Symmetry: C3
Subunit: 642 residues, 3 copies
């Protein structure tokens, strides 16, 4: 039974015995056990004394308020299997490394303030790539459950990881840097027969790993099962104290790293220029890792940066304000040598971005199986969403007030897919997939120069309004890009006092006959449903089927007399030869409703359009129904389409 009023008194005491009950009072107080066994001093949980060590007695988490200084915190977390609650405002003077099976948790008022003297990383979760590789014993196709190596070449330990690579190029996107393939897999079974060890993986392979590509495998060092609960890195007012950092949380070769909530603020001054590499959270070669609920303010580079062969990565519920990209999947520069890995299986869901300096949500030109679900970007300085890898899918995303395009692909990028996405008041376009096609399904764009820019693919369903030039702009990024077939079907693209329905860009080589337009609502555009520019000669129109161009004077019944009737109706057409125009006429569907013996074959002719000045009256447009039988007196139903 030994009681001490302060730390210095306790640690100077020379008479401790192992059977003693020991108590410290004050801000780091607690109960202690004396031992002679060599213990790792950290001045919070272990203290040196004459004759041995004092060990704080506790179950559950450790608390930062137990520690004398930052140095001790770093020492404590240098070991695995730690649970530390940050319940004080810590002043960092070095990087804090976190090891396997560890949790760092913050209370409402816990903080790590970075060092104002030197910009450095705050939290590191750092594994490493293999130092040596062995060849696969045989090719392993995509979908393989097992890989094989020569017996004894590699220690395969169940529950640990392997890192596979080859010279095959990443294939998710254009991959302009020529990044090579890699994947991280967990060993779940092992068997050896005939000199070959067969290693069963948790997940199957997503590329063909071939010996002709020097397919090989090594053992990485992973940091696994790290939880960061409510990390609070820096604090508002940081810019008045010149207090910054580089990367907030940097992970490399981590597995099951889960980041929940928290706030990461201020590795640049508010509203200031971007700073290369200064991402808030960076996942490099991480597997089964997540960021859920974290908020980001005033970040020099990306909110969450995902690169290398990061696989089964998810970002949910983040709010990112004044950052370069809220989320960016990244490439790796091969300027200085080979690099390996693209992200595979990425989900961003229910995330919000405000005032990004570049695209709200971004990929670079590699990555596979990338999905964004119910994300929203507001007031981007560039695009709301930018896809640079192929076939990125967007489900129910929204972009508001982007300086350029709500959603866009980019040079050489193939067919992003937009489903029920909504674009409002983006300056240039709602959707810009004019670089290499797009699939635009049930989307809406309102308040742009053009609702969609597209060179080929499909615009199916959806609704477009308040677009000053046209609702759909068939164009290219550059003239060299190939136009492909474009279907526009079931789209509501009515006239609302603004632009035309569809703009064909002759300037860059658009052939309108590669477009087909079926069952669209183009009501109100009259003779001005199309905009054309840059044509040297009048081009042939798209195929057009059962579109709606007018809402009045569009169905009725006529009675022939002597084989003919004149019908007043909003029939329409252009019969001129002006180069930037189409020659076209309404499709008038005729059906016979009485059946005299003089019934003949019916046709539409004599289309006249009222050109009263200054205001034309389309209700005095007319056409003639003529029968091949000059005695025809049939009643004929008529319907006017485009």
């Amino acid at each position: 039974e030994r009681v001490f009023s302060d730390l210095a008194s306790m640690v100077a005491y020379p008479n401790f015995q192992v059977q003693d009950k020991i108590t410290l009072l004050g801000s780091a107080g607690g109960d202690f056990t004396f031992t002679t066994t060599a213990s790792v001093v950290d001045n919070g949980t272990v203290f040196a004394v004459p004759g041995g060590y004092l060990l704080r007695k506790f179950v559950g988490p450790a608390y930062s308020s137990w520690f004398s200084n930052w140095t001790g915190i770093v020492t404590f977390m240098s070991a695995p299997n730690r649970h530390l609650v940050v319940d004080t405002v810590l002043q960092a003077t070095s990087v804090l490394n976190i090891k396997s099976n560890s949790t760092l948790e913050f209370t409402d008022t816990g903080r790590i303030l970075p060092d104002a003297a030197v910009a450095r990383q705050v939290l590191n979760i750092t594994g490493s790539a293999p130092s040596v590789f062995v060849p696969l014993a045989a090719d392993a196709a995509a979908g393989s459950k097992v890989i094989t190596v020569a017996a004894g070449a590699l220690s395969a330990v169940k529950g640990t990881y392997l890192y596979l690579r080859s010279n095959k190029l990443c294939d998710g996107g254009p991959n302009t840097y020529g990044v090579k393939i890699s994947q991280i897999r967990k060993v779940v079974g092992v068997s050896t027969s005939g000199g070959v060890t067969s290693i069963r993986l948790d997940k199957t392979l997503h590329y063909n790993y071939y010996l002709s590509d020097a397919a090989e495998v090594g053992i990485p060092t992973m940091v696994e099962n790290v939880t960061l609960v409510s990390p609070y890195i820096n604090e508002f007012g940081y810019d008045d104290l010149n207090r910054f950092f580089t990367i907030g949380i940097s992970a490399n070769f981590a597995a099951d790293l889960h980041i929940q909530d928290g706030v990461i603020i201020g590795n640049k001054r508010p509203g200031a220029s971007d700073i290369e590499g200064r991402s808030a959270i960076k996942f490099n070669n991480c597997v089964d890792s997540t960021v859920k609920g974290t908020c980001f303010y005033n970040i020099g580079w990306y909110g969450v940066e995902v690169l290398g062969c990061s696989e089964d990565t998810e970002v949910h519920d983040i709010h990112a304000m004044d950052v370069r990209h809220a989320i960016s999947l990244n490439w790796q520069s091969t300027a200085d040598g080979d690099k390996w890995g693209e992200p595979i299986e990425f989900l961003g869901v229910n995330c919000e971005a405000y005032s990004t300096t570049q695209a709200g949500f971004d990929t670079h030109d590699i990555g596979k199986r990338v999905k964004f679900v119910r994300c929203v970007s507001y007031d981007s300085a560039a695009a709301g969403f930018q896809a640079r890898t192929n076939g990125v899918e967007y489900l129910n995303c929204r972009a508001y007030r982007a300086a350029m395009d709500g959603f866009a692909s980019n040079t050489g990028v193939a067919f992003p897919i937009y489903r029920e996405c909504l674009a409002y008041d983006n300056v240039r376009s709602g959707f810009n997939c004019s670089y290499g096609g797009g699939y635009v399904y049930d989307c809406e764009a309102h308040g742009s120069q053009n609702g969609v820019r597209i060179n080929g693919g499909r615009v199916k369903g959806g609704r477009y309004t308040r677009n000053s030039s046209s609702h759909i702009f068939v164009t290219k990024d550059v003239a060299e890009t190939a136009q492909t077939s474009l279907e526009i079907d079931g789209v509501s693209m009515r006239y609302d006092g603004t632009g035309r329905a569809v703009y064909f860009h002759g300037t860059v080589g658009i052939d309108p006959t590669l477009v087909s337009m079926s069952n669209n609502d183009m009501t109100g555009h009259g003779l001005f449903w199309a905009l054309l520019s840059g044509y040297t000669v009048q081009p042939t129109p798209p195929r057009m089927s059962r579109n709606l161009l007018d809402d009045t004077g569009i169905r009725g019944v006529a009675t022939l007399v002597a084989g003919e009737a004149t019908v007043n109706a909003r029939v329409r057409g252009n019969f001129g030869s002006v180069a930037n125009s189409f020659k076209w006429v309404s499709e008038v569907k005729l059906t016979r409703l009485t059946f005299p013996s003089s019934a003949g074959a019916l046709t539409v002719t004599s289309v006249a359009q009222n050109q009263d000045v200054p205001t034309p009256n389309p209700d005095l447009n007319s056409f003639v129904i003529r029968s091949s039988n000059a005695a025809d007196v049939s009643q004929v139903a008529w319907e006017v389409y485009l």
Copy 2:
């Protein structure tokens, strides 16, 4: 008795027993007594020594718990059954967490609120120095007009009216923002905000800004308010958890029960959870039973609010975004950016999921309403979006708008056995995309907009009902495209309501599946003169006798087929006939232009046989011997 003890000295080492007691320190420094972590004793105070959370079991009384929570930076674990006699206020950077056994029983002597999380409105406003349009990252005020501290909040308002919906009360705009940057130059202070402005804030509307005192960063973990059996004890409350001017309030799981008797009448204002002027706040997983008013009420300028995974049973609305009555003076704020996801409602006394007539960017995703006494879902603000929601057995409509409300959007929503209709957007248009309605009087009631895709069955009157709430509402164009609305022994495909002035020519019907309806694909009532029909393009009406090949003899062939039409003049009917598509398959020199005539329909005496209906293909060339493929559409 520890507190009555005469002679404590600072050095003295201290222990309170009693299984919920502990270790203590003496001090003379002034401390706030709560009889749980701090006690007055002659000469000074005893402070409990602990790290991590406090526990309710440490406190002698509810009043001590209240005093403890009256300060910010508190973490309290409720590990006992607490008997409230006053409101528990929670302040910033605080957590209230309940164990499996912890509970707050409401005050039995006074029905009152249980939890309050209450910030305050600004005490003074200053005008904006310049117009700030929607999308503005910065606002300006005269230098020295107020002190804007980075990390703190601003409350902006003007006389511009909220614009999310009809706004019949004339609620004015407001928003709450966080200061992230401040610069002063040339007598103007420019304040950079976390999030951009969502309205124009104009000097002409007396745009102004003040500093609210927010309660920020509160977490309520598994709140258990009241318990089953409460009604036998006559133990109720008014509002369970009331928050105003809060930021980052997060409520997780828990159960809130019983501010009315089970199945009893509603009580105005008795919401389980109320969010007024709250930002970045959420309710996830909570369960609600026997609530007099709304499960989660959301009002004022609440922005970026989410409700996930709740279950609400015997409540007025599970979720309701609200208006504010301006009868006694101006009010400010509509909700902006609201998500309800994966929520369930049972036996609501009014709509399952609701808005009033203001609110912007409101979305409901995979929510479900069962057995509502009114609608499953009610939109009273404009452009509410519903994704994959479901309504079962509502007493009126599965999904509905209301008077004056524009264009709800329904995407892949499903309506089953709702008495009146699946979807009722007859008040001001609707967009009904790939939806389904089964088991109603009418699948969809709609005055204008779009019904695209989807599938309709078991509707006794008709699948689609083109009508209005009142004859004075405008009919607008209606597209009906790609809809499956087959005959299944019940109603017709489309009902045109002449009584309220519906002009069928404003309707267009393309590529729908109307198989089986025969001559009775349309219902019409209230027409005094036969109306002109909708445009119709390549719909399916029959599945048999609908494609073949005919050979002309002397320019003619008679073809048996399920061709159909009505040629009469009855006011409540359409004159129409099949679209028969003809294509030539052989190419004699006598090939002429082709036409359909002599449509005849069988009228056998018990049941007509449409396989014996016929038409004639006639050529303009009297010697034509062409083979002609024919296909029958509506």
Copy 3:
């Protein structure tokens, strides 16, 4: 004070007033008591004269306990919160009771007994011991049920279990499982000899007196939270260390399982073992599994059966299991069974290398939905529906050995919305058993993109399918063909299969199919495949499809009432049984209006037949007028 526990518990003269401390392992403060206590050797110890109780606030810790037996004893009561901060070696089932939480630190584990395969965690209520008849019919949607006054005592906040002889109606129900539901009492009143019991949730079947509808009081285990359960560990198979069921729940309410890892009740990649599911929910309500990972499981990852209602499975990863998720039937071979799942959500789940279907139901269950789930490398299907009207939203199947998505014998109309199927061997979607609704889906890399006997294929996109994109067929010839709408589908030629294959062998009538506004570009004369017809069948109705991309719109000027137009007009006019007779729809619109304007028609369709490669830029048709003087300019558009 003491220092080890033989030492503390040997002490012969404890009295109630003593202040006691154990130093070292499992250390803390204690007090003495003479009241009968449940010895657990962690929080309660027997001592000369009575018992020592550990003093603490908040959770207990497994590090406090001398052995597994004590852990089991502690958790045998309700209202327990235990943190597993050690590696526990199980030798018996751990039962968990109401209002309890079992939480694991990253290193905490339960290692199963290597000597005997048994269950690890049990959360076990019980069915009623007695039932009483309903006093009146209670239709679906009822809020209240009635019983004779005094027949049963219904306590607010407790539960009821309702059943009748009516058969479960979610699917084919080949075992004849009967209906049941679990409901919570929220109100009770009695009048005129009848007790009316108000329920939390409404009834989802008609409960009729003619079906012997009855109700009893089950004993539920309620409010159990399992935080990060870690069951078994990698390398278990080297120690022959297995189990049967990992977490088995029956008659539980508000059981919530968060994260954790369950591994190894079979050897890696070994044969399935009947019944050895990782998690099993039987007759559970308002219960969830979120985040859990599963490896090397003999049966199902999550098994859901009985009248489990309002069950959700989110965010799981399952690798080397029979099914990741399976809703189950109950065999009635030895007697009557009751209950089908009602209201089930699977969201954001991932399956790899399942030995059978990735995500599964058997032939009962109502209101089943899978959202954003993904199956990789299934040895059977990615997704299998055996109950009626299972809905799939934005789900993905990759490289299944059979079908990406499939129904099965006697199963009606699964619904696929925006689902994606890649490189599944046989098909992307196989709903050829009983119809399907295939909406905006994609299938790439299969023998056939979709196999279907009736229903709708609407929208979507199909590529790289070796036989055809759509296969109109049946499982067996006895299955009914119903109408099939194919509309708005992109099913272009890309060097692989045809657009649509009509299976005459099983009696497919092509006229029951309608094809409108599809993109069939590139297929030329080979847009259909037919087999097993003995007589040329009549084709589907076709409306405004795209078959060619070049030579498909122009303007012709008639001369003497005719113009020859070179265009990619197409048709087949032969009689070969496995072929259709058909021709392009050429839409004609007059652009000039001479007095000699007559009615227009297409004739003389001529198609180049150069060997080995035909040149369709040499195909032609003639526009002919009824007026031999017609000189009209005529717009022409070529469709299928």
